[PDB]
């Protein structure tokens, strides 16, 4: 029971990683819905660096092969009320992403579901007892609108739409 992501070019199996964190943007403007919406960051490398949880691998939207938090999910932002500040999310338990060589990298649906649920709970501590929705990247250059990463000198691009499209109540 997997989330199987389409990636271009095909990442070989030894470019499989552990997802150890990710970076969000909270969607702005008024909602009379009691929802808070998050998308993969609309920032850039500077926001990724500021999280200080990357390892050696350079990647967008997801931190791959980075540091893990000690007990539970950790979220941090320079200013929670400012939708132009990215939100850093550090996992306590990593989620393996296994690439086949044949053009996809897959993750366990149940593990990603439980990850999003934990993240959503920490976000609820920060913005209130609200419904939490993850929605796809709002857009950007190819390396940032995709989950993209450098493996061994080659750049890979995984559509992350499946990872960020769900409601958490």
């Amino acid at each position, epitope marked *: 029971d997997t989330i199987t992501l389409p990636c271009r070019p095909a990442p070989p199996p030894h470019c499989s990683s552990n997802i150890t964190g990710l970076i969000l943007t909270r*969607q*702005g403007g*008024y909602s009379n819905a009691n929802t808070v919406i998050f998308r993969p960051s609309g920032g850039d*490398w500077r926001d990724i660096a500021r999280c200080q949880i990357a390892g050696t691998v350079v990647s967008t939207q997801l931190f791959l092969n980075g540091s893990l938090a000690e007990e539970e999910v950790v979220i941090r932002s320079e200013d929670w009320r*400012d*939708n132009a500040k990215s939100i850093c999310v550090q996992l306590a338990t990593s989620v393996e992403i296994a690439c086949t060589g044949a053009g996809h990298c897959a993750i366990s649906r149940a593990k990603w579901a439980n990850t999003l649920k934990q993240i959503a709970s920490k976000l609820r501590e920060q913005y209130g007892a609200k419904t939490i929705i993850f929605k796809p990247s709002s857009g950007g*250059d190819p390396e940032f609108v995709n989950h993209s990463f450098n493996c061994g000198g080659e750049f890979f691009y995984c559509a992350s739409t499946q990872l960020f499209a769900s409601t958490w109540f």
Partner: antibody
Amino acid sequence: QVQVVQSGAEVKKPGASVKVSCKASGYTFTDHYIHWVRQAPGQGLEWMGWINPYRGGTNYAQKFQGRVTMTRDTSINTAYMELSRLRFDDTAVYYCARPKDCSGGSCYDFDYWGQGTLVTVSS
Amino acid sequence: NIQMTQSPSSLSASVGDRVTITCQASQDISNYLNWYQQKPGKAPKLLIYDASNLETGVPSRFSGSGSGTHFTFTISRLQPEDIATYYCQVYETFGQGTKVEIKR
């Protein structure tokens, strides 16, 4: 010195779309987000969203999601706002706004504004 | 999210006296409130930023103060060229504005 110049006024038909340009100069284009804020005639100010010109990221106000697209061309320091499926109450003066350096600063203290672009929605 | 309440919606004053405008924030926003002056037909103009600081080139009769949820914008001695609508702003939210007009 810093300048922010917008395209000229337009009329567009209901259901059609408009694209407004915002050309900046006199600073490092990729160092500041560009925000769009609009003002219906004799009304208040309404924020529409921001674009990150460095890598193209955006964050649109929820009420315009699915109807607006913000882009930029770094080679000519120009940001664009495209609003589609225009309704009558989209008639308004559309401003681009540039905040102070978005790192450390709020990225919401709008130092410089364009002159505005009146978009009239009418047949 | 963050609501704003700006007061009064319009005031009329004689030249030279003191004008005070308030903005009440829905939640603690620290000192991240800005104040803009908008003349008819013109873009808004930044006067006060981060609730206290005077934008460079702004005359010193314009002041702002406050923190948390209650903020104050004041013109010490209203000048003729100060006719405008004034807005506070917290992040993407703008207050309703205050049209100051002169009595003569």
